[PDB]
Amino acid sequence: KIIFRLLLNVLMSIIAIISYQWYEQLGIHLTVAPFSLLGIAIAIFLGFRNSASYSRFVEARNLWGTVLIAERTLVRQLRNILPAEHDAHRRIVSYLVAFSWSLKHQLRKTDPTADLRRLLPEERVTEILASSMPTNRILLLAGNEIGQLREAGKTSDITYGLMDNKLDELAHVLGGCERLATTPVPFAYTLILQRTVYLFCTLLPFALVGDLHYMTPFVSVFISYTFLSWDSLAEELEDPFGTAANDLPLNAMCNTIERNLLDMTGQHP
Amino acid sequence: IIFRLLLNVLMSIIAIISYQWYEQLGIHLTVAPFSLLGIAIAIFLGFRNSASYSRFVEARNLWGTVLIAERTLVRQLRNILPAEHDAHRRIVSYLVAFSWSLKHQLRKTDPTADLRRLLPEERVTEILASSMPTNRILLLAGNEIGQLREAGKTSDITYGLMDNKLDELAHVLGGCERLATTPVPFAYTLILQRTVYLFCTLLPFALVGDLHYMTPFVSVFISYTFLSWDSLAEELEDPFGTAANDLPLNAMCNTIERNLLDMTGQHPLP
Amino acid sequence: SKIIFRLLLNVLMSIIAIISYQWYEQLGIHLTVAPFSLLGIAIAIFLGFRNSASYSRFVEARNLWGTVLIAERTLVRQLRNILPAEHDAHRRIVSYLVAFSWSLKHQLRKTDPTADLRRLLPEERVTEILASSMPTNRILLLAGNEIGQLREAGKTSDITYGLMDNKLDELAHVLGGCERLATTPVPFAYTLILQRTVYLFCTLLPFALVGDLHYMTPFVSVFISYTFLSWDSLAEELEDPFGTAANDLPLNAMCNTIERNLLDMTGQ
Amino acid sequence: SKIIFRLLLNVLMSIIAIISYQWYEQLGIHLTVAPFSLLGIAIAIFLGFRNSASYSRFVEARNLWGTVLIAERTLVRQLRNILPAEHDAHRRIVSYLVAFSWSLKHQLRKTDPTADLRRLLPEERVTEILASSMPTNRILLLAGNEIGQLREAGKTSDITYGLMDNKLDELAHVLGGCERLATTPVPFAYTLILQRTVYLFCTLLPFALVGDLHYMTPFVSVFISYTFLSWDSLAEELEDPFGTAANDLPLNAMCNTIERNLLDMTGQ
Amino acid sequence: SKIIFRLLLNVLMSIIAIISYQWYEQLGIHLTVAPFSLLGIAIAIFLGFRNSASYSRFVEARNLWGTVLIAERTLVRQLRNILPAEHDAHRRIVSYLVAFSWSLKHQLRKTDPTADLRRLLPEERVTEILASSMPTNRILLLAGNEIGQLREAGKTSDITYGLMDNKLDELAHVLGGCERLATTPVPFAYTLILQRTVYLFCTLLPFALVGDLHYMTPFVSVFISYTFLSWDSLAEELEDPFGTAANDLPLNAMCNTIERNLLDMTGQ
Ligand SMILES: [Zn+2]
Ligand SMILES: [Zn+2]
Ligand SMILES: [Zn+2]
Ligand SMILES: [Zn+2]
Ligand SMILES: [Zn+2]
Ligand SMILES: [Zn+2]
Ligand SMILES: [Zn+2]
Ligand SMILES: [Zn+2]
Ligand SMILES: [Zn+2]
Ligand SMILES: [Zn+2]
Ligand SMILES: [Zn+2]
Ligand SMILES: [Zn+2]
Ligand SMILES: [Zn+2]
Ligand SMILES: [Zn+2]
Ligand SMILES: [Zn+2]
């Protein structure tokens, strides 16, 4: 990965050293002052870009953090307002749990058919999978469970609207996660930075060899490691729903959500 | 942008063959002053690009709310009034019409073809007669919500629940209008774009003393780094502007229309 | 602006440094570029963060006025969908909302709102507004009465009353925001430090450049000075958003768009 | 200024640097500008972030105080709109809201609230307020009882009670926000050591600049010193917006505006 | 912290660079200052952004605990204004709220919350709370049962039940926030990369500075090392706001202030 290019940068230094003997046999000079200017501007641009990536990562963590909050209070409101409708308690929790797993499959571009059948009846699974957005359909079914208790006079419009806002909050999370996934800036994330940091890292030893007869690979790999490590960190934080090392553990976050919702409805795993 | 890189290579070749006659005229160009100028320009480019990225992000959040507000409004209709299927299809029309009309407004394109597809020509003429057609569609959508209230089909509580979604839409409309007008740097972005253009063309004359024949290669690498970062802030400053990328705006209006058709049992086929 | 004046004074400083270049080593005064690159970089950093504060504040002023259009649009829409038979109460409330916009413009510009208020309101209400030490705030209080009368007359439930009252709370957050922006600018210490250092650094620059540049001193010292001055002047023209300059907010055109919007919704 | 003493103390070090430059090679002390350019730019970067964080505390503090004027403006308006006859209730609540502002100012300034409290409230309540742990929270609870007494008396429905109740919640969020900015500043390691670093870099710069600028050392080294020192001491001021510095918030003027607003003539 | 040991190692790395500068020619190692300025400045830029992210994380944790005090204050105030007679619910709800604060404290600190919980609640509720793997969430559910009973008993309307329910929603968002901060830290690649690069840069620097500074190497080197290491440790000590150091949030002091505030609003 990054060590593979760190090794290549060492070979370019070796190329720049053994070919430094034939430098004067050509009209080439490479001072370090121009590469200090270029390198500093790249560092500034990497500093701002890396900052924008971390902002996405925090927003993704926050959006998933709201899933746990909204689904907790929706179950809490269901208990305090309607403590005797335990049938709706189980059915709504199964929709809320399915919403979390289906959102994970949505952001991961995987098949939710396994987790859907585990939690919901088959007639519901076919209705949910047949939608252009199954997570949106799950919120609709959860709203029908809330809304059917309203038609039965079991809850007022006020206490209905109280629970409605929780579904409204989940919808904002779904729209927010959908936004973060389908929002890549144009190819400037690679056209500008992926090329330049690479091209600057491999051309740097050819300019550093004039000052340092043999210390070039040490200094060049140190600068190349500093720049490449900062740039590669930005790529990981840019896509927080992937399977990288520094990406959101979505499977663990969904297990915590199902554990919470079952702990509130008196069910032991 | 490639044209200005060929101009830069041509200026480097000029600075090489002309490097003879600088002697004794007293015209010496070092690298330290141009290194100070370049680092300063890079700082301003970084701050400018930061404000541009923020405008691009706010544009995404506004259109994201369009998808959210229209989904929850249709969901509230099915959960509260599951039997009023005629009111369903009417309100779904205006919400889909609101999305396309808003896109055509930001892109200064004609919304007539999209409006005729979704709404009857009586309402299409009323919408196209108003100077603010996107606001007119919101008013018509409210008249459907208000008619369900006067008909005694919705309480004042549930009317307020749906009314809040039209408020989320109206906040988006005004937000996109505020972004659509030319931004806060009143034609001052043309100065910083030319400051970069002049710095990249005066650079090979400063570098040729230290680099000689390596000037066309190092000067074009620096010019490309500066010209690419500037042109990026140009694309971000104008998310709805002329000659922008219509893919995400078209995909969003298509996504919401598909969603609402699915939520109203219209899309799958019998 | 005066930016083109200080560019010419910078040209004169380049000429002084070019011809006085001789007596430097005699008096012992040398000026290299290296310490000026340190100072010029720290000034560019501080210039960047300062312009960031000026940018964010100009955006906030644009956001506030954008809310006036939104809240008045929806408050009129709600009156239509809820009380379509009350056409008389429509025009009474729309006139107050239009007056609120114009009075907020005249307040932020310190101009006379008496002319616009008499165009939209009866003289009894104009006297009531202009008698208050905070006339714009009194306009909201009168708009709250038209909403309140509809509630006490039984034509509006407390629920739908609360839906309309919230729009007046949005207008109340705009009034306080504009007042806060108008009385609290970016601290003077920022514009005091940078104005001094940028100007002193631009004039001393040809002295520290002539040793390396010679006859290229004027064509480079101006280029560098034009970069710092244009950036410092960008904040000069972004710190007065409520004014009447070319780069200020078009509050007159904004107040016209609002009055044009609210009359399109009420069929006038 | 707080810098005017340290600026002159730096000019003394520049004289110590110029007299002892030929004696560098006799004592074996070569000094260049390149290392101090690295150290200076790193401090300028850290100063830019530090100063930016301090201005954020200033903006939030000004915004928190702006909400007080907005929330108390509308709370009086809703009383005047929903219960236009309860002028005795209007008066009692307006006095509590004005006492809330002066009490919060004295809380953030650590001054005595007994003065402004007796100016606005009966003595039976000045004792109940001064005897509480948090007196500002005590004023809010008394303002809440007035809204609650109107509700238990049937004069106010649960819907219009919640409208006014939310305005007091907005005031409680301002109290918690000001307590936050006050009772926990920036970490002291920020200000403690960053002050050390800028001073030492300013008083060692002429020893490294004298070689390049043999006699221009005092000027260029005080120009750089003024730039770095004016930025640090300004960030030091903005960290404490509720303080009494020159660039802090005018809390006494703001409380005057709130009072002049609410008791405009009678009941706003 | 342990920064003093890293400075003395740098003083040893400088004398090793001085006693070994002779064999630079024989071993064929050249080291100029120009590349170490590009590296150091880039390290400084990344340090400035990283330190900036750590400060905002500390501030978010500070704001979360600020919301606890605000929400618990207004929930007690709303009870005294809506149900001034129902004191059986006053004492139970206040005890549940104070238990929420202490449970959250021990949760972020990973300490035993039994002592504080039994000091506030009966055993049949202390056992149920500690029997759950989410004890702090269970305290909110029990607090909801109190508000829910008052509504079912006909003592509050659904409107007033909704007004109080939105305070438990506010407390639920704080719990999710603190958990999200405690579990999900600043991505470890920041401390991974920057600590490697800063430490290696401070040891290699005297070998590049000794060619220009000679015997002045240890002073300028340990100065630059002190600046970089202090800024790096400052970001490290801001990344853990729920720690036990004096540098972190005084969670014990905040929970004492909350328990005093709620017991004061109920006259205890
Ligand atoms: Zn919530
Ligand atoms: Zn149950
Ligand atoms: Zn919504
Ligand atoms: Zn239908
Ligand atoms: Zn479809
Ligand atoms: Zn609104
Ligand atoms: Zn009408
Ligand atoms: Zn102006
Ligand atoms: Zn408000
Ligand atoms: Zn009154
Ligand atoms: Zn001398
Ligand atoms: Zn609150
Ligand atoms: Zn009590
Ligand atoms: Zn009892
Ligand atoms: Zn134990």
Author numbering:
A (entry chain C): 23 to 291
B (entry chain E): 24 to 293
C (entry chain A), D (entry chain B), E (entry chain D): 22 to 289
Reproduce text from the manuscript describing this model.
The human BEST1 gene encodes a protein (BESTROPHIN1, or BEST1) that is predominantly expressed in retinal pigment epithelium (RPE). BEST1 localizes to the basolateral membrane of RPE, and has been functionally identified as a CaCC in heterologous expression studies. The simplest and most logical conclusion based on our results is that BEST1 functions as the surface CaCC to generate Ca2+-dependent Cl- current in human RPE. Since the structure of BEST1 has not been solved, we generated a three-dimensional human homology model based on our previously solved Klebsiella pneumoniae bestrophin (KpBest) structure and a chicken bestrophin1 (cBest1) structure.
On the other hand, I201 resides in a loop between S2h and S3a, surrounded by hydrophobic residues V114, A195, L207, and L210, which are conserved among species and thus probably important for the channel function. As the Ile to Thr substitution changes a hydrophobic residue to a polar residue, which weakens the hydrophobic interactions, this mutation may change the channel property by altering the local interplays between spatially adjacent subunits, but will unlikely disrupt the channel structure as its localization on a loop renders flexibility. Sequence alignment reveals that BEST1 P274 is identical while I201 has a highly conservative substitution in KpBest (P239 and L177, respectively), prompting us to test the predictions from the BEST1 homology model with the corresponding KpBest mutants (P239R and L177T, respectively) expressed from E. coli. Purified KpBest mutant proteins were set for crystal growing. While no crystal was grown with KpBest P239R, well-diffracted KpBest L177T crystals were obtained under the same condition as KpBest WT, and the structure was solved to 3.1 Å resolution. The KpBest L177T structure mirrors that of KpBest WT, with all-atom alignment RMSD (root-mean-square deviation) in a protomer 0.4 Å (Coot LSQ superpose). However, superposition of KpBest WT with the L177T mutant based on the alignment of single chain residues 174–180 showed an obvious shift of the TM region. By contrast, no currents were obtained with KpBest P239R, while currents with reduced unitary conductance (mean amplitude 1.5 pA) were recorded with KpBest L177T, suggesting that the BEST1 P274R and I201T mutations result in a complete and partial loss of single channel activity, respectively. The structure of KpBest I177T suggests that the BEST1 I201T mutation does not alter the pentameric conformation of the channel. The condition contained 0.05 M zinc acetate, 6% v/v ethylene glycol, 0.1 M sodium cacodylate, pH 6.0, and 6.6 % w/v PEG 8000. Taken together, we concluded that P274R is a null mutation that abolishes both plasma membrane localization and channel activity of BEST1 due to structural disruption, whereas I201T is a partial loss-of-function mutation that retains plasma membrane localization and Ca2+ sensitivity of BEST1 caused by minor structural alterations.
